[PDB]
Every structure is written in structure tokens, then in C-alpha cells.
Structure 1
Amino acid sequence: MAHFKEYQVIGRRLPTESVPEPKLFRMRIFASNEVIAKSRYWYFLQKLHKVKKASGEIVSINQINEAHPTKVKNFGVWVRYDSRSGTHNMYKEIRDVSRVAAVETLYQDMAARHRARFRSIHILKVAEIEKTADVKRQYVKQFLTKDLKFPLPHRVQKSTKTFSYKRPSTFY
């Protein structure tokens, strides 16, 4: 939907005469601008309580920045989503260096593997797999082995003139 941001969003039902100061609910929305993020917020509240935008108010909207943006992390991700023929709950694991980076590539995976567009996906939970061997997925696990090393074989220097006079080489 773009390059993502994270957002504490906080709204409440409108105060009434018999009910001044109503209850206050938070969501952490994953979206690209604040405008979308408020919209998503209402989207999910109407799918949980008895409010709608008209009858409610947004109280606050604050972007949450990564804790340690320069630390590799192993993420567990949880997602409700819709296929062509019915809806499905899912768990994947993404390994990156921020919740925002992660949620980005999530959506790219859903797109690619299950043809799932942004509308068709609920993030359910995103949280940091702390102690390893709570990492459950091979394609991630693979990167935790100790003293990890690998080549990057058959390399491709991207040319800049239409002709070349050598005959290239993929050594690396």
C-alpha cells in the first residue's frame, strides 16, 4: 500500500450526557500515511464494537518508531486473510531489522504466494521471536546457524554501454 509506518491510534465513542468520558480503545495500525491509518482504525473498530466514525472521535495518532532499528530480529507474524474460495488464518516468520520492514515484505509475500491484495489481509499480531528454537520455520531457521558464511556465485556486472569489448565474467 506503500512503504509503511506504524501508528498508535486512539479513539472513543462521542461523549454523551449520561456517558461523559467513554472507554477509549487503541490499535497499532500498519499504514503509509496517517490518513489511511485513521481510516483503518475505524475499519477495525466497527468490526469490533458498536461505533462508526460518525458516532465516534479520534483522540490521538502517534507514529511508533523502531526500538533498535539497527538490530536483526526474528519476527513471528500472524494473519487472517481471504483466498478466492474462503478465508484463512496463517502464521509466517519474517527476519528483518524493523517491524516496518517486516510488515512491508509480509504484504509482498501475500501478494506473491497467495495473490492476496492489501484489502484482503488482516495483520493479527506481529511480535519478536525472542529465544531461538521458538523459530519454527526452516527458511528463517536456516539463517541462525553459527559462523554462517556463503558465496554469491555467478555474478552479473550490469553494463553501462550498449557494447562491450571484453566478454564478461561472473567470478566473485
Structure 2
Amino acid sequence: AHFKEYQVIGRRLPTESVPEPKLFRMRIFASNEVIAKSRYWYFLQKLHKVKKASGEIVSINQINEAHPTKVKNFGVWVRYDSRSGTHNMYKEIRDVSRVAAVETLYQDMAARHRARFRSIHILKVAEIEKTADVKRQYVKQFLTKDLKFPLPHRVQKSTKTFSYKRPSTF
């Protein structure tokens, strides 16, 4: 769905003789609130020895985009599970917001490398501030000055089943 980027904060358990466990925050991409709490324990159990019954979640926050109408180049580090063993991948997306860029990534992974939602891990999504350090080629070609490209051979969608005009393109 429309992903929403969430901050989840976790505090293991207040016990006698160990007060104040430190605190643990993460940034989670999930389609709603309830998945992001469950996606939180999926990673945080891998990092150190906790459980959901030995845990509680402090607070959740919805992180909006800082600047939607600005156009950003994004470099995304991705770890994912293949049919063979897992291996890393670095990909670059040009998009409008952070949370819309992950939308175009999962579609890109499912198209080319046939990876569903459960196999992919999102390592770090970063904005590349300066230009001319863009590594990939297919992102780089839009950075040329005075870029103008035509859209030839446009089709037309007409509601009536019969048209009399012998219809023509552009």
C-alpha cells in the first residue's frame, strides 16, 4: 500500500536491580501502525536477546517528509533473500519523498529479481545532496542541462465502442 515511515522506540523491561534500560529506536517502513510494531520485533530480536513478552514499545511516531515538493536523488542499500543464499544490492532512485521511494523499490525488486515483501531488508535510505557523484547510469542521464524529450506515438482511450474518424496519433 502507501507506505508510511514510522519511528518505534523500545524499552526491554523495568526490573528490580536493573532500572532504566537504555532505549532503542528504529525507522520502519510499513503500510500501517500495527505492522510496524510487529516489524520492530522482527529486527530487534536479531540484534540482542529480547522478546515481545519481555518487551514493551515506548512510543510510535509518523515521520512526514521534510520537503515533499523538492526532488531528491536517493541511494538505497538493500539486503535480500534469493533462492540461493542472501546477498547485498545498492540501487538508486530519483523520486519525490522518502516514503514514496521505497514504494518504487519493492516494485523494482519484484519485477527484476522476483523478491516479495518478506525477503527484502532495507538497510539505509540516503539522500545524495550534491550531484555528479551518482554512481548508476540510468539515474545520471536525467541530470543533463536543458533536458527535453518528446513523447511520440500517443494512444487515445475512447469510451464509445465505434469511432468514425479513422483515428490518428500525435
Moved over 6 A (4+): none
3-state SS, counterpart of residue 118 of structure 2? helix
Secondary structure, counterpart of 1:90 in structure 2: strand
- Report the alpha carbon displacement of residue 70 of structure 1 after superposing the two structures with TM: 0.4
Distance, in Å, in 1 between the alignment partners of 2:88 and 2:16 is 41
Please report how far the alpha carbon of residue 59 of structure 1 lies from its aligned counterpart in structure 2 after TM superposition: 0.2
Q: Give the Cα–Cα distance (whole angstroms) in 2 for the partners of residues 47 and 164 of structure 1.
A: 62
The one-character-per-residue Cα deviations of 1:137-156 (angstroms, maximum 9, x if unpaired) are: 11100111111111011001
CA distance in 2, matches of 1:123, 1:167: 51
Could you give the per-residue CA deviations for residues 14-51 of structure 1, whole angstroms, max 9, x where no partner exists?
Answer: 11111111011010000100100011011100010111
* In 1, Cα distance between equivalents of 2:73 and 2:143: 10
In the alignment, the residues of structure 1 paired with residue 76 and residue 144 of structure 2 have an alpha-carbon distance, to the nearest angstrom, of 22
How high is the sequence identity, in percent, across the aligned residues?
A: 100
Instruction: Work out the CA distance in 1 between the residues paired with 2:153 and 2:101.
Output: 28
- Measure the CA separation in 1 of the matches of 2:135 and 2:166: 45
Corresponding residue SS for 2:139:
helix
2:142 match = 143
CA RMSD of aligned residues (A): 0.7
SS in 2 for 1:55: coil
Please report how far the alpha carbon of residue 87 of structure 1 lies from its aligned counterpart in structure 2 after TM superposition.
0.6
User: Number of aligned pairs?
Assistant: 170
CA deviations over 1:44-101 (Å, ceiling 9, x no partner): 0001011111101100100100010001100000000011111110000000010111
Note the alpha carbon deviations across 1:76-133, whole angstroms, 9 max, x for none. 0000001111111000000001011100000000100100000000000001011112
Alpha-carbon separation, structure 2, partners of 1:167 and 1:46: 64
TM-score (structure 1 length as normaliser): 0.97
3-state DSSP of counterpart to 1:141: helix
TM-score for both structures, normalised by structure 2: 0.98
Alignment partner, residue 20 of structure 1: 19
- Corresponding position of 2:99: 100
SS of aligned partner of 1:118: coil
Equivalent-residue separation in structure 2 for 1:48 and 1:30 (angstroms): 18
SS for the counterpart of 2:11 is strand
Question: Deviation of residue 164 (structure 1)?
Answer: 0.7
Displacement of 1:169 in angstroms is 1.6
Unaligned runs of 5+ in 2: none
Which residue of the partner structure matches residue 83 of structure 2? 84
Superposition deviation, residue 161 in structure 1: 0.8
Distance in 2, matches of 1:107 and 1:63, equals: 21
Distance 1:59 1:138 in 2: 43
